[PDB]
Amino acid sequence: EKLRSIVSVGDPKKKYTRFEKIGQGASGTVYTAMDVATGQEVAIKQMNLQQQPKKELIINEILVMRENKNPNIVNYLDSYLVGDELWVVMEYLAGGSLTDVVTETCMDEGQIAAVCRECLQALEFLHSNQVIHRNIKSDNILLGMDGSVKLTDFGEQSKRSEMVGTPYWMAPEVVTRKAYGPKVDIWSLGIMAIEMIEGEPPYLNENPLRALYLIATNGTPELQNPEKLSAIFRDFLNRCLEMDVEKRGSAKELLQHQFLKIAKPLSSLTPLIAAAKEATK
Amino acid sequence: SDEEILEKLRSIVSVGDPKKKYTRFEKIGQGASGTVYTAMDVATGQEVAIKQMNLQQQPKKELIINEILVMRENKNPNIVNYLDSYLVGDELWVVMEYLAGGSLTDVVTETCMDEGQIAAVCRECLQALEFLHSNQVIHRNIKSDNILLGMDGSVKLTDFGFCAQITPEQSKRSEMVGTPYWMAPEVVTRKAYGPKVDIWSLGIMAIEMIEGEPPYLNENPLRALYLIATNGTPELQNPEKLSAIFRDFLNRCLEMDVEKRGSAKELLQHQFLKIAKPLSSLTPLIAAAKEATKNNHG
Ligand SMILES: Cc1cccc(-c2ccc(-c3cc4cnccc4n(CCOCCN(C)C)c3=O)c(Cl)c2)n1
Numbered sequence: 360e361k362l363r364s365i366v367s368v369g370d371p372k373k374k375y376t377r378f379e380k381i382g383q384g385a386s387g388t389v390y391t392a393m394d395v396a397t398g399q400e401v402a403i404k405q406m407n408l409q410q411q412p413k414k415e416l417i418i419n420e421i422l423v424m425r426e427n428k429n430p431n432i433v434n435y436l437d438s439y440l441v442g443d444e445l446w447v448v449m450e451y452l453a454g455g456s457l458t459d460v461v462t463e464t465c466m467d468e469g470q471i472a473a474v475c476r477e478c479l480q481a482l483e484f485l486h487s488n489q490v491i492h493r494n495i496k497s498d499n500i501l502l503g504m505d506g507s508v509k510l511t512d513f514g515e516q517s518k519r520s521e522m523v524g525t526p527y528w529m530a531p532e533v534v535t536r537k538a539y540g541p542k543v544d545i546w547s548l549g550i551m552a553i554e555m556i557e558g559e560p561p562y563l564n565e566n567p568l569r570a571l572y573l574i575a576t577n578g579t580p581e582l583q584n585p586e587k588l589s590a591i592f593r594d595f596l597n598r599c600l601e602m603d604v605e606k607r608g609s610a611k612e613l614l615q616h617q618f619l620k621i622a623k624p625l626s627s628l629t630p631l632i633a634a635a636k637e638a639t640k
Numbered sequence: 641s642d643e644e645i646l647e648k649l650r651s652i653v654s655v656g657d658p659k660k661k662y663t664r665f666e667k668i669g670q671g672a673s674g675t676v677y678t679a680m681d682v683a684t685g686q687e688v689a690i691k692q693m694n695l696q697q698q699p700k701k702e703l704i705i706n707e708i709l710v711m712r713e714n715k716n717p718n719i720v721n722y723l724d725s726y727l728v729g730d731e732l733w734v735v736m737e738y739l740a741g742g743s744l745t746d747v748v749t750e751t752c753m754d755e756g757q758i759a760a761v762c763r764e765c766l767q768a769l770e771f772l773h774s775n776q777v778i779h780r781n782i783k784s785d786n787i788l789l790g791m792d793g794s795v796k797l798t799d800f801g802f803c804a805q806i807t808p809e810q811s812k813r814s815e816m817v818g819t820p821y822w823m824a825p826e827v828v829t830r831k832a833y834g835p836k837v838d839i840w841s842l843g844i845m846a847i848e849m850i851e852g853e854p855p856y857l858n859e860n861p862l863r864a865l866y867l868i869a870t871n872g873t874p875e876l877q878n879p880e881k882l883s884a885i886f887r888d889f890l891n892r893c894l895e896m897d898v899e900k901r902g903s904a905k906e907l908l909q910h911q912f913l914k915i916a917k918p919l920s921s922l923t924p925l926i927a928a929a930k931e932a933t934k935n936n937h938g
């Protein structure tokens with residue numbers, strides 16, 4: 360009844376058309392579709408709630424997401440109960456992910472600065488509401504066809520379990536399993552800016568346990584070609600990748616950094632989107 | 641590139657319908673590696689475990705290739721047997737024999753094992769490792785979580801996703817692969833290593849059977865790596881509680897000098913194993929572990 364006071368009434372099978380499956384997350388199945396009245400493209404996650412545990416957690420997470428929108432977060436539109444399934448409808452960003460741009464183009468520092476600024480705007484908002492994203496990385500940055508930049512995926516593994524993937528975006532204080540705060544996202548942003556300029560995530564050729572150790576002890580990964588970065592970009596990276604949590608910049612502080620002032624207009628990202636789409640098809 | 645590693649995986653798996661051969665699919669688990677069911681062979685009544693995976697969503701497909709190939713190529717009564725596999729569109733289904741007695745982890749965390757029961761488990765595990773090492777396969781992820789038990793007390797090794805195949809041209813590995821608390825010091829410190837890293841991990845599993853946990857489990861995984869590198873052979877909480885023969889077996893599994901550490905073939909002759917009880921002795925422990933699991937859930 361809290362879900363019924365959270366969802367909308369109506370038939371989403373009538374409001375939307377052209378359903379196309381993308382894939383299946385842990386939550387549920389994800390489709391793209393189009394609003395029959397406005398032509399807006401949407402992404403719809405269908406979740407069988409009969410039954411997933413911590414259902415109230417999904418209800419509350421969706422609750423919070425509906426009341427705290429922001430231009431740099433993928434916009435929540437509506438939810439519907441469709442026969443024991445819960446459908447969550449989000450706006451659809453058709454420009455793909457930042458990962459595709461990073462791997463198929465070489466971004467210049469003005470383009471990187473523009474992405475960093477848009478992400479830092481999102482993080483300032485999240486941190487002001489005491490939200491920690493924890494997975495700031497390129498596959499969680501979605502791009503609009505106008506060059507808009509938005510965060511997604513801000514929604515647990517045993518000591519006894521082996522590590523299969525490398526958590527290359529995680530701050531040293533996360534990796535050493537300490538308590539931590541919003542500035543882990545700033546660290547992750549620094550790592551993503553290195554990814555943008557090098558074209559691949561750091562530690563790519565490392566086993567996860569070796570990378571875990573390097574993160575805890577070295578902190579920043581060694582830039583492959585540091586001579587290739589401008590002084591102001593290198594300074595920005597140093598402020599994001601400070602091992603001392605107190606010294607590491609906050610999002611509010613870094614929004615004032617001079618590196619962000621070389622940002623190109625966001626229209627400068629749309630040729631990157633075009634290249635990535637040509638390259639991946 | 642990555643489309644041809646996918647095609648390589650698809651090529652090793654036959655296309656067909658798992659319902660042609662198996663029925664009564666009951667979910668028993670869901671995870672990152674896919675979804676796990678029990679099912680039954682329609683013709684023979686054999687109970688099986690079946691994992692369903694979405695290939696397009698799996699990273700490191702080459703590790704799935706290696707796991708399937710190693711299972712197919714190395715069947716043994718002390719290994720959870722690979723039966724079959726099926727390609728259904730984007731889906732891969734892998735069929736394994738089913739062991740209904742849970743894991744050794746449930747036993748070690750909820751029961752006290754006596755030395756005869758411990759010796760029985762060690763012997764069965766050493767039989768698997770002697771077979772694998774003689775086939776130039778290193779498991780590298782031995783731990784109680786990867787020991788499955790049958791309802792008759794049978795003992796079988798699983799989880800070959802981290803295993804390494806060695807050759808006479810490249811007899812050793814040096815990469816940090818495994819689960820920290822069970823890793824041998826030469827692995828943790830990136831020295832050239834061989835099959836006896838599995839003997840080390842078995843020694844750690846014997847400490848689990850003694851104490852309930854591997855050394856340093858309360859520490860974070862990275863700290864445990866540091867402690868393994870710096871301490872070497874771990875200390876028992878109460879060594880005075882073990883027989884002299886058990887202590888000697890443990891010493892020979894946890895030897896720092898890899899040349900002095902026992903091989904699986906050598907340890908199968910150790911006098912500690914001569915006190916092993918029959919495997920039937922493990923079914924009361926399985927029953928206790930099953931009951932304890934109900935207590936923790938209620
Ligand atoms: C349970 C719950 C509670 C709250 C929110 C969501 C939820 C939030 C984001 C989305 C989403 C929006 C999207 C917009 N435009 C392009 C692709 C998109 N995609 C697929 C690609 O996602 C990229 C990140 N990663 C998976 C690779 C999405 O999933 C959805 Cl459908 C659901 N869900």
Ligand SMILES: Cc1cccc(-c2ccc(-c3cc4cnccc4n(CCOCCN(C)C)c3=O)c(Cl)c2)n1
Nearest residue numbers: 689690691707708711734736737738739785786798799
């Ligand atoms: C991709 C690939 C390639 C090759 C083999 C496998 C694979 C190997 C083991 C199994 C498996 C067999 C099993 C038998 N009897 C009881 C429970 C079982 N279970 C669940 C209990 O978990 C096991 C412990 N482990 C997860 C920590 C299993 O998973 C499966 Cl289905 C698949 N997979």
